[PDB]
Amino acid sequence: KIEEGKLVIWINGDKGYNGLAEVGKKFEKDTGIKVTVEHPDKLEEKFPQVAATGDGPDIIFWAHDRFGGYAQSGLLAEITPAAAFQDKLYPFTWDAVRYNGKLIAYPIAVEALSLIYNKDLLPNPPKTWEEIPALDKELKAKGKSALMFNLQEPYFTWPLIAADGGYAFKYAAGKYDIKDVGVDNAGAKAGLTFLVDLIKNKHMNADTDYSIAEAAFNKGETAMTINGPWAWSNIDTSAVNYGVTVLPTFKGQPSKPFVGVLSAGINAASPNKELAKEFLENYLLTDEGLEAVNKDKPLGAVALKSYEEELAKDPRIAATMENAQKGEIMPNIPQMSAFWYAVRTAVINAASGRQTVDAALAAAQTNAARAAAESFKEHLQEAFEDLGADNLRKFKSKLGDRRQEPRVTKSAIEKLKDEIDLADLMVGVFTSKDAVSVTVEILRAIKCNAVADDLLRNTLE
Numbered sequence: 422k423i424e425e426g427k428l429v430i431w432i433n434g435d436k437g438y439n440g441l442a443e444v445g446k447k448f449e450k451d452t453g454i455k456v457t458v459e460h461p462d463k464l465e466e467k468f469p470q471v472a473a474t475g476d477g478p479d480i481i482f483w484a485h486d487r488f489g490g491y492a493q494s495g496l497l498a499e500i501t502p503a504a505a506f507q508d509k510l511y512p513f514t515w516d517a518v519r520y521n522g523k524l525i526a527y528p529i530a531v532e533a534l535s536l537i538y539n540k541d542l543l544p545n546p547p548k549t550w551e552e553i554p555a556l557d558k559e560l561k562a563k564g565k566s567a568l569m570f571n572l573q574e575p576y577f578t579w580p581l582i583a584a585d586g587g588y589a590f591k592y593a594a595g596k597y598d599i600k601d602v603g604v605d606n607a608g609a610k611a612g613l614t615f616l617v618d619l620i621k622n623k624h625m626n627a628d629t630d631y632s633i634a635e636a637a638f639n640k641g642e643t644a645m646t647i648n649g650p651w652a653w654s655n656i657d658t659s660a661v662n663y664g665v666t667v668l669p670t671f672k673g674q675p676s677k678p679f680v681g682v683l684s685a686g687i688n689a690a691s692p693n694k695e696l697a698k699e700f701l702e703n704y705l706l707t708d709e710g711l712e713a714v715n716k717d718k719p720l721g722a723v724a725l726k727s728y729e730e731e732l733a734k735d736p737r738i739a740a741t742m743e744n745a746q747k748g749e750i751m752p753n754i755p756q757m758s759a760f761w762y763a764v765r766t767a768v769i770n771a772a773s774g775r776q777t778v779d780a781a782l783a784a785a786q787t788n789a790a791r792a793a794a795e796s797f798k799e800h801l802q803e804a805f806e807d808l809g810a811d812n813l814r815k816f817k818s819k820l821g822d823r824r825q826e827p828r829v830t831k832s833a834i835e836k837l838k839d840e841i842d843l844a845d846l847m848v849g850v851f852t853s854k855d856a857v858s859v860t861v862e863i864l865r866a867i868k869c870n871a872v873a874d875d876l877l878r879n880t881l882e
């Protein structure tokens with residue numbers, strides 16, 4: 422499925438992929454070899470499904486937190502450059518791509534979130550989170566609002582949850598301890614309570630996503646947003662006059678974002694391994710290669726010393742590195758994808774009012790330690806689709822009548838939209854193993870025995 426004598430590359434659709442295609446045209450004009458760039462949907466989950474049997478791209482781009490799990494499954498080739506090349510990039514960027522003693526990818530650039538504001542609507546931005554409710558009121562009298570950002574992905578809400586004390590896994594004596602999880606302490610509860618109260622008092626809406634918020638800022642309808650360096654380009658095209666600065670404090674403490682390093686790995690089953698090393702070391706990681714990508718969509722603070730010393734004179738970049746020093750570098754261990762699925766479910770149920778804050782975070786502490794939890798959620802979704810709409814109305818009636826603990830209110834059931842919402846409510850209230858046991862019990866009481874049997878052989882077994 423992988424053809425000898427050319428190169429195929431995969432990268433996310435919010436980065437500068439037309440700029441990267443210009444670098445491959447130059448490689449073709451010096452050697453004749455053709456390069457193709459693609460941007461599929463959900464690529465961080467498609468890559469481990471196709472590469473296990475030897476298919477996929479020659480080269481894959483993503484942040485460093487996903488790569489430890491790919492290496493444990495045997496999907497990547499080892500990286501081995503000469504000491505003369507290694508001295509061209511900062512030593513702290515090589516530390517982020519080192520796993521069990523070996524290097525497993527090439528580092529490209531450093532990314533962190535900041536606060537972006539409209540100078541004509543608000544020439545002096547606020548220094549604390551506590552000030553935002555009163556400022557929303559002044560702006561409505563002009564037909565506007567104060568702040569809008571993406572509420573569906575937990576990367577954007579984590580800086581406030583961590584300000585007064587929350588954490589992922591505890592670091593002690595040279596290693597992360599995978600059975601000491603920090604999403605349910607006193608500091609984590611206070612930050613999530615402040616976010617839900619903004620929604621209750623009608624300063625924000627619970628269905629806001631990435632493209633809704635991007636259009637409102639660029640049209641002048643809102644005063645502030647929260648985003649990374651890749652977004653600066655489309656703002657330049659618009660009519661808005663903008664600045665970039667440090668995030669606000671909470672209870673007197675700084676906000677603390679998680680920082681990522683964009684990186685490039687090589688497929689263990691590729692037959693083009695030495696063509697791939699020549700493209701990356703001699704064409705992309707140079708002054709003129711990185712300049713072509715940066716002009717399409719900006720990269721942040723790059724890994725190559727000779728070019729980063731010039732970019733550091735830009736005041737937008739100085740603010741990016743101040744937020745990075747108040748935050749923390751992400752771990753790369755294989756347990757990180759189970760952590761991100763658990764926190765995503767907790768924020769969605771609490772912002773929509775289907776669960777209380779305290780009950781949602783106590784279940785996340787348990788789900789974050791279970792490797793197979795997200796797989797169980799996908800098998801529940803498929804069983805609800807197979808019942809059909811008439812039989813699924815009977816299922817939801819019996820769930821609302823249960824007297825066993827924990828109980829589910831009838832108002833919360835009427836607010837669901839489809840089969841994906843129902844599977845997320847079940848794993849968030851009961852945790853993942855108990856969710857399957859209760860579902861099988863209700864299916865037997867409405868006489869749907871074939872569906873219950875198929876679900877059992879693919880989970881608890």
Ligand SMILES: OC[C@H]1O[C@H](O[C@H]2[C@H](O)[C@@H](O)[C@@H](O)O[C@@H]2CO)[C@H](O)[C@@H](O)[C@@H]1O
Binds near residue numbers: 435577761
């Ligand atoms: O929301 C969970 C998600 O966060 C990070 O993904 C970022 C990525 O690093 C950025 O480059 C940008 O594309 O936005 C993404 C969030 O929408 C983690 O790297 C990722 O593993 C995680 O699932």
